[PDB]
Design a protein around this nucleic acid. Sequence first.
RNA 1: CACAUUGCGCCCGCCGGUAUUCCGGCGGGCAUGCCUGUUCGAGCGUCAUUUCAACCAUCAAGCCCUGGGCUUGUGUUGGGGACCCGCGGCUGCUCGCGGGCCCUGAAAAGCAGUGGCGGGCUCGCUGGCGGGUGCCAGCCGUAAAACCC
Lengths: 94, 167, 82, 254, 146, 33, 184
Amino acid sequence: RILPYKPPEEREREEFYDLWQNEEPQPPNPMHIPAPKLPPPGYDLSYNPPPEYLPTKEEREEWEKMDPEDREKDYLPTKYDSLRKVPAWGNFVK
Amino acid sequence: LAAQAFKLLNKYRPETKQEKKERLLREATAIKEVSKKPYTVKYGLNHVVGLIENKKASLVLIANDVDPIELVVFLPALCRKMGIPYAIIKGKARLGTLVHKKTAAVVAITEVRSEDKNELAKLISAVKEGYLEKVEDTRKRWGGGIMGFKAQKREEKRKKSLETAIK
Amino acid sequence: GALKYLEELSKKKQSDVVRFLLRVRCWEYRQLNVIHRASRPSRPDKARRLGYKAKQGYVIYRVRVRRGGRQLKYQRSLRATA
Amino acid sequence: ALEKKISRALGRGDVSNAARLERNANLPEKTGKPRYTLNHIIRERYPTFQDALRDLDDCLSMLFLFANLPSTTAVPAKMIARCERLCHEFQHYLIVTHSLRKSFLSIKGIYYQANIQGEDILWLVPYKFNQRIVGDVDFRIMGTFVEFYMTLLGFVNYRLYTSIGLKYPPKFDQVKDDQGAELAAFSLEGLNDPSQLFANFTFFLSRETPRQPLEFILRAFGCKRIGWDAVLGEGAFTTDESDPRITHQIIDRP
Amino acid sequence: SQPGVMYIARLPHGFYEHELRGYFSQFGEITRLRVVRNKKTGASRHRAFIEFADAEVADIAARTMDKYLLFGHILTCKIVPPAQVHPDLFKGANRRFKVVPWNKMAGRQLERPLSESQWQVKVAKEEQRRAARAEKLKEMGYEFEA
Amino acid sequence: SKAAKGAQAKKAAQAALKGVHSSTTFHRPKTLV
Amino acid sequence: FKRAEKYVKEYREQEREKIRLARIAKQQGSFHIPAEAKLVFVIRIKGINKIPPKPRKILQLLRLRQINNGVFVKVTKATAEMIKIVEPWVAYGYPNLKSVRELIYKRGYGKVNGQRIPLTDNAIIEENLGKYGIICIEDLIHEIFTVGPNFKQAANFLWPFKLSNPNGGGNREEHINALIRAMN
RNA sequence: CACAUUGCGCCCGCCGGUAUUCCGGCGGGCAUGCCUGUUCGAGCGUCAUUUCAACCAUCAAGCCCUGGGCUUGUGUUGGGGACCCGCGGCUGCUCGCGGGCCCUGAAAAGCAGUGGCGGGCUCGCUGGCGGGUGCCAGCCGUAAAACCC
């Protein structure tokens, strides 16, 4: 009727399925507004871009000086010589 | 002295309902397939009063906030007449958590294991000299009368009014 | 055997300990309602000899009754009206 | 109400009862799994497996970020370890089924585009560096999303692995993982362009190259002979550079 | 400015000078302190004497720690009456009691060489204490030829 | 001076014996329903 | 305020500490280990409030000032006797490749100009050591794991790792790695 | 809820109509007093909270005449007793060093003495040099060294 004794060491040593098993189509409700997808990255973002996207030194030094959340884009395109010469993005977690 | 008393009493804590069931189960499983006398902090008001009257309790700890105070009002006099060292603890909840309960009005030690008979005797010499000698001076006299500034002015206003003509 | 000590203490109602306690509790009961519930009995020796147990189903209630008379005398006691 | 009972057990000195009640509270710090069972919520949120694939974009970008992220009090170290696990089992599905299509290098990170069952999935993995968490960042909001995404990708991986035929979860090994195998620590057991681009090809990686992007991409597109130097990991081809059988070496060195 | 002398007995091991000064400096200002020791081995005899700056802070400190359990030691601190304070009570106050290896030091004055004149008179001292031992054992009933 | 030394001795007395530890209208709290 | 038992207790540990350092200095510093140099990772933990000057000076040299703080050192004759002096205050053991790779990558910081910066660029590693042959972040791992001619310059370049407090997770071999995994 | 008028609230769900919002209907619910329990709380009601724990070698190393033995691993509370000794000094009495016997709760009421090395502090002389010091939580034994840097 009851299980016998087990030592706490043996108890500590002792201690998946498909969600869509019954999968049916459902009409989408008109109230559901899906979140829009982010745009795919462009030629600007590449570490070795075509050289027509590189801003000048005057444009770059003005961009760093002028305050955040007022820029059209959160980055300036940059060219790097090698993969190891590519910094980590400072606002990746942000 | 409170912390030193609970250093000994925590060594002799009565077992909880969970680990008692484990010990019953362990001894049952061995039988299906020699123990010394248990030593434990004694609790229970009618139990401790019987132990004090029979001169078995070596040390008695009484709570100081029993809501009907009559339940413990005789215990310091009973321990003194019987010769048992006693101490009034601060908190029936702290005594209540030493045993696995909510409150406990009184807690006693009868016998301890051989390892700490010296530490029980040092605690007895600590309590009966570091607590009982100070209260020997003030336990026969009345307490209270902690009149403050406002009560002293109000008594002076009272006696000022009874100086012309007591009605 | 704490309840035998409590029985003898209630015999001496005019003593210093009991008259002090009965004074400060009379004031406390007058600050409360005429009928209210007590969590525990204020006289545990008396309640236990009258048939009280600390079980689920037993409750204790406190009550005041105005003493005196109606020169007509009521044939039941004030305990009965309580 | 359960956390009040644990606090009462701790304050009263019952360290045995607090330990037993904590076992009932299935905290993520010792379990590594989400605290609450979210199986029913994901079902009403995605009634069909296609909707699970359409929203896999934000799921994978979160779980790949938290694989490289340090351990905090909202997302404990064991919960980070299961994030790194579920990214690898999804990656082993991609190399076997050859679903990886496109890839891209950006100044932000590496973008991967994969087509599973006719739906494209684009997620971003950071450069395998130290990530700064400067400023006002709330990991309690981050941990709520990871907790949802860890349960979503687990049920997604089971459906995908059973579709090809492999069992789930795939058999993993500590002492391979502790040696640094990463992708190589997992073995896939069978039952109860991308086959031609680098099929006849043998590759070697130096210390200068990103191991995790490169090994995943090359094996997705044909390569079954990849080696690297011993600091990168274990579970490779010949570690030495002097092996005549190796033909192509990826070197980024001045 | 009346100093107060306080006598602490039943000191535990490890409660000797800097901890005794540090603890009772919280109570009040301390001007002198001496812990009694031994010559043959540097070791406390479990007593101490504390001289406070004020007699009032001496009264409070003695009353508070009068019976204090401390590592299985019921402390006893009592205020020494001002008449009973000996003038030479703090002769070694605020100075380290240096442990001196007397058995080591006296053992190697034996092993250091002496002069031939010194060796002869030690020989001379040996023969009269041997003769006295011989005389006292002749009454005992024993004699030694050599 | 003397009063300042007495307060330091009294605070050391209290610590050695008891330790270091030790709008306006009232409305009924919004408890769980 | 300070209790009288705290004063007496500190004398007992210091007397035991003065004894234990005395036997270590008197006895020969020979361990039951092969003479081949290895890599150990030593984490400072909270053992005793008061530290004698000889173990205190070693924690200056090993830069193990704060509690919950770890550094890489290599096993030599001078280092092994340095570790044995500060044995109670440290938790030390043998890393694996997974622990050394993660610890640099999750919490790795650099030593530039008296300042601590996160090594978010390989260009940072260029300007600091450069001439010692290491070129990137993985070369820093290679020098530390397989100890080479520039391990001392590589180990001093990394700031001491400020590990997190675990929630419940002598010499150890692999049991340091469970401590690293819980503390990372 | 309301002399109870086929009237009017509130919570959850459903149905029919141009309906995610509108209208009507429907279904299940919403009195008071008291008991037991659950959960959420309030109180200048009371309490606790500065961690008096464990942590030498439960065997290692070197040996010898090959299997037993040997050597090293320095680790002791304080006080007292017309008691019995050995050795150092003391002209001697005696005092130090170690023993043999006895007593005492981890007991206690000045009786402080051996020369130093380094460091700290202070005083003088021309950072340096020389003196002192009831200062060392630093070492040594009569010189000095070590530590330190």
